[PDB]
């Protein structure tokens, strides 16, 4: 009875009738047409295990169970995903006209909606007037601009990030409370409000002259270092800013942003663009650390600490611990030797393809300090989901905030959807999101 033998979870192979051996081998051959095989055993004694589905990597216990599994959710979903991937991978190369359309659309997103040199002028003037206001109550401190205002990695409307440098014999919570009172009393601003629970504690106000929201922090040195590195890179390589803007807004990654962000998601996506630019062949951005450092070993790269910008062309590095390097400090060039001629459309498609099809996001670390590809284990970091090394805090995976189930699945979905959408003429995408871009 094939009826028993299809449901039996353990088969006495010797007790099988030659005709039953025949029928079972035929059934199994049929099951193979759906990726289901007898698992070869290690020490067989008619033992435990029967069938492996290579698609789902699922152990199945009998023939009837294999036929139920073929038609169930997991197997159907995997069949689909495999089909979608084959489609994505067999896409014909884009036409010159489609590439040009994409190129013009990307640069026009940056030009019509991005932060302009005159917009930076406005925001720097905001900082100058506010520093006038703050210092004439509190003269030791200084003000400076950071974040997107300088990097241009957000749109015309985005918030103005302003950091207060203060002396150590001055207490940070007290400092922000005093600043809150000062800005409340001063008529240059409206809607002055503390935001002290946010990831970075800040005072919020609206500059009445420019209508721009300002977020005033204190002692946020790391964010300023980060801003200066990314600003210098964007000034040296013209494709950096429009690719970051497209990646963030066209792919709809902005849907992740909230005002309690701390800007971490957008920072992650900027780092991902920079990583792609470093990892391209040929590359369009240099790596921050490498063989020009005499004695540099990619292992124990975590003994290095990146510092400020010099001449707007170099980033300082220190290695204060014992090591094989000749020098304790140095500087790395932020500029290639003319990674000359590739259109924005081609870069946009390549970037989408890199993250949709080509880079094993779950297995590696997005690391913008070295060119060598880091496995999770190289960092002794856990596997799964997204991993981005903060180049200025190297034990920190900044993408941990992307790694909720919702956001992770969204990011993967947006890569696939965007690539699918932009790879073929439908595309001069016109943004029209119905939400503020901060
Ligand atoms: Zn399956
Ligand atoms: Zn948006």
Numbering used by the authors: 254 to 578, 611 to 711, 720 to 731
Give the exact sentences the study uses for this entry.
The terminal uridylyltransferase 4 (TUT4) and/or its homolog TUT7 mono-uridylylate group II pre-let-7, and promote subsequent Dicer processing, since pre-let-7 with a 2-nt 3′-overhang is a good Dicer substrate. Lin28 binding to pre-let-7 competes with the Dicer processing of pre-let-7, recruits TUT4/7 to the Lin28:pre-let-7 complex, and promotes the oligo-uridylylation of pre-let-7 by TUT4/7. The NTD1 in the N-terminal half is inactive since it lacks the catalytic carboxylates for the nucleotidyltransferase activity, while the NTD2 in the C-terminal half is responsible for the nucleotidyltransfer reaction. In this study, we determined the crystal structure of the N-terminal LIM of human TUT4, which consists of ZF and NTD1 (nc-palm and fingers) and is sufficient for the ternary complex formation with Lin28A and pre-let-7.
To obtain the crystal of the LIM, the N-terminal region (residues 1–252) and an internal putative flexible region (residues 579–610) were truncated from the N-terminal half of hTUT4 (residues 1–723), yielding hTUT4_N. The crystal belongs to the space group I212121 and contains two hTUT4_N molecules in the asymmetric unit. The structure was refined to an R factor of 21.1% (Rfree of 23.8%), using reflections up to 2.4 Å resolution. The hTUT4_N protein consists of three domains: zinc finger (ZF: residues 253–343), non-catalytic palm (nc-palm; residues 368–489), and fingers (residues 344–367 and 490–723). The ZF consists of five α-helices (α1–α5) and three β-strands (β1–β3), which compose a large structural domain distinct from other zinc fingers or zinc knuckles, such as the one in the C-terminus of hTUT723. The Cys2His2-type zinc finger motif, in which Cys306, Cys309, His322, and His328 coordinate one zinc ion, forms the core of the ZF. A comparison of the structure of the hTUT4 NTD1 with that of the catalytic domain of hTUT7 revealed that two of the three catalytic carboxylates in hTUT7 are substituted with non-catalytic residues in the NDT1 of hTUT4. As a result, the pocket is totally closed, and the 3′-end of the RNA primer and an incoming nucleotide cannot access the region. The evolutional conservation analysis and electrostatic surface analysis of the overall structure of hTUT4_N revealed that one side of hTUT4_N is highly conserved and positively charged. Altogether, the N-terminal ZF of hTUT4 interacts with the dsRNA region of pre-let-7 and contributes to the stable ternary complex formation with Lin28 and pre-let-7, thus leading to the efficient Lin28-dependent oligo-uridylylation of pre-let-7.
